[PDB]
Design a protein around this ligand. Sequence first.
Ligand code: CL
Ligand code: CL
Ligand code: CL
Ligand code: CL
Ligand code: MN
Ligand code: MN
Ligand code: MN
Ligand code: MN
Lengths: 259, 258, 255, 254
Amino acid sequence: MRVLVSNDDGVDAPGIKILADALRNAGHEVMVVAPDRDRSGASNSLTLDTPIRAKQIDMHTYSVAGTPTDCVHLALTGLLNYDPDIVVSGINNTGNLGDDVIYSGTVSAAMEGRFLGLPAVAVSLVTLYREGQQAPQYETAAHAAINIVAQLKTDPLPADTILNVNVPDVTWQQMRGFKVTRLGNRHRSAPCLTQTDPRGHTIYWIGPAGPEQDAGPGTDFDAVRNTYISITPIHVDLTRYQALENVTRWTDRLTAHMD
Amino acid sequence: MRVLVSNDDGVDAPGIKILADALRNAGHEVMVVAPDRDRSGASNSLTLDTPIRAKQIDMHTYSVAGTPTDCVHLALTGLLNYDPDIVVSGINNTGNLGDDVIYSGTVSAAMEGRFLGLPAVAVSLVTLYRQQAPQYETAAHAAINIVAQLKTDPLPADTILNVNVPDVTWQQMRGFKVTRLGNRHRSAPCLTQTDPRGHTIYWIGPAGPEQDAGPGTDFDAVRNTYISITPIHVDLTRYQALENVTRWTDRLTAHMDW
Amino acid sequence: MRVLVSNDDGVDAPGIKILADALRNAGHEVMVVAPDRDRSGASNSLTLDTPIRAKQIDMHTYSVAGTPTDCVHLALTGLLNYDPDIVVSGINNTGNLGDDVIYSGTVSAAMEGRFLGLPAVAVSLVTLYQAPQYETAAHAAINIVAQLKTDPLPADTILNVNVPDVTWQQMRGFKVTRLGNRHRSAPCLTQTDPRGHTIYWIGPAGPEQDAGPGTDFDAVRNTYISITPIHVDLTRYQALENVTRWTDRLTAHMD
Amino acid sequence: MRVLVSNDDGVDAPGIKILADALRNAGHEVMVVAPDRDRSGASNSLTLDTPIRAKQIDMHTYSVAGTPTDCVHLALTGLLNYDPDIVVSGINNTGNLGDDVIYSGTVSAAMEGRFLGLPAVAVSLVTLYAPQYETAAHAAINIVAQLKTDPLPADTILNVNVPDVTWQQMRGFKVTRLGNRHRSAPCLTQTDPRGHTIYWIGPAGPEQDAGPGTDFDAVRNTYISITPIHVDLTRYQALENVTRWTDRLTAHMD
Ligand SMILES: [Cl-]
Ligand SMILES: [Cl-]
Ligand SMILES: [Cl-]
Ligand SMILES: [Cl-]
Ligand SMILES: [Mn+2]
Ligand SMILES: [Mn+2]
Ligand SMILES: [Mn+2]
Ligand SMILES: [Mn+2]
């Protein structure tokens, strides 16, 4: 089939190159449109007050001076002569779990995919802090992504949600299987710490997570801790339909009161 | 009751001062914790890799060098000797409608309130491109009535309210309306032009008539001079989809080896 | 005379208001063009790759979404029908001394005035650690501006001015000075975060600093107003003849 | 000799690797300390209000989450057991000429070297409209060897700009002064795709200062340009005149 690929770490990052290469080896057509540098720490909104620049790198690749949402939007509304079947965003160099999901740049590019009418997937590798060096297993995450893509064709899912995927950092021979999960939480517990800096000013640190967190059986945290790949289905429309009838009766009692 | 107030435009903004003064006039206790300068344009995530400064401005006010989510998190976990009943974020100097809501800084301060166990509301004024002073007093009037009403008749759901107010005098307003989110950028095309030095550039252009802004939407209410109220999710997990995705995932497993 | 006024802290800050009001009361015409928010932390360069927006607040006041150098450039090349005799930038809420002068945003607005042909002045208040003495700094500025009219200096340098944070009654006089140095000795410090990981700080300056008799630091420490004349052209003319003979020898070698 | 190398574009850029390799092959020792990502667009000041993180990549390389001035300052005040003879910053992916020199990130790393008492050089490639990084490196190693066996006084910085061509096409070296181009640049009033008013800063006209003797005219005619610049902004030659002026002022206000 025909695929469109983006990310939030930049067009020159090791994980986006390994992903696109594997997809082509498997027999697919692939075009890449991604940011000119790393965008972590930047806001995810569409750019409306100023114009945007882009340049061709090779016959299949373009570099854009804007957000991950800017990259997917321009690709689908006039930048390319191309009609894709699906959007895939990643492979990210750290995990995207629990309370981190609503503000993730990797997730924002997949969202713009569905808004414009196509199915979409985000993929992330769960790396762990060390001292020296140990090279990350991007090859392991790519093998999972090509099998997910082929299957979405032979047995299609409805088109009103996005899939968020997280992969343990090991060789494939160690993996135990797949599991379907819900979002956990881990920073409701973080109780601030008071200190003094080298020039005499009072400063504050957000605390580390305690044991009273929500990361048990059924959650995304618990699956990856036990060496399984995690898949969570998420909303694309923030409207809460199941609450409309009740809020209307509430608003009626409000207006009768004041006037 | 006891109220906690924040925003995304900054601690010296005209809109946050008018809101706080009105709440105190109606007999409530109020503490303010907000950013040291306008944050519109920055990421909304919590700050974990570095420490944060904060200082006292007057007996009821603190200025913080960090995000709107940083302000609410610190106030509720050790910064204050205070146990609030509810959180209010606003009044923002422009609207927050349709597809703009998921990444709004004003909305992010109310979300952190609910996560840590309290009811929450976001309030914005719908100003228009043009000397005509903004009607902040009109939006503050709507806010005090909503607060006193939640005190008698609370709301059960895992939900928060997003409120938008037309920029007119109170005598000119037509009523309140409950709405769904609309959309206007799915239709927005890409235009090609040339800059002063000869480089090709691209603009995201204005929406066509194939937009979703008719009867029932947030856009249609404020255009016809009504105040809009929309209830929104705080958990992004899609529960209605779990049974079908599990069937799907088991089939995949049986296909592959190892 | 006709004055143009800008700053680094924004059009809504208390020090730019107090400066513009004192100048008008003394009988000058004043236009204000300044950033829409506090700019401390971004590059001082001119904006070339995108277009810029601007909003007229009242009759003699404008708000610009860009840098301090962007404000002064637009004002002199087409935004206004106005012909100024001098540019003044300030009053800043902290000091601008010694090795901090080259990258200061307050100083950058003055620099763009001189590159385009006019005399220029920068003004800062030296706050320590309460309501700042902005009125004391404004009294110094109106007296300096009047004197430049009747008794003029050559316009190929700019004046950098720093004012101690006290009442006029306490001030001792004016003094002409050179730039000092403070960060040269400032050491690297190794500490730990709440997870046990290593982080570095740039620590405070010890007693070995360059801050004695003759410098900008010593003057304000002893309650005098400091004036330092600074370069507008970074070319080192006095080294040109010697560097030329050196380059001649280098070229004979490679050939 | 012992050399310390930094830049403004980041530790992973192609110009900094080609410079370091050419220096080692010429027989010098080299340590590299540079930013974790591209830095154009941020303030050049030292970071004082928060702490800074760093990571050792290999035996001779370090990656720092901060400014080019932060990189050089930490390297010379305790992060390393190393005693360098000179600092070199580059090779930059575009030119650094005329009125753009005071706020250049590439130039700022060289400055912090001199403030702390060593000699220093900045090198940039003049790209127009596969970049000849090798041409620029051959120029830099010849300059470094001459500074040793025939020394200059260390009270200045050398700012070097190299045309983007093959070595065979180069015409020579030339010593120059800074020119100017933006003083002429006019305000242009236009409308956005909604008819709302916007302003552009337009291109330089024929009135610009770019003739014989300037850095602009040398690189346009295929020569390598070298400009000596100030490290101290004090204008010593105006001090006596400004002292008499301030005397006459103080007699007026009594
Ligand atoms: Cl991400
Ligand atoms: Cl907002
Ligand atoms: Cl400043
Ligand atoms: Cl640069
Ligand atoms: Mn990332
Ligand atoms: Mn805002
Ligand atoms: Mn300032
Ligand atoms: Mn650069």
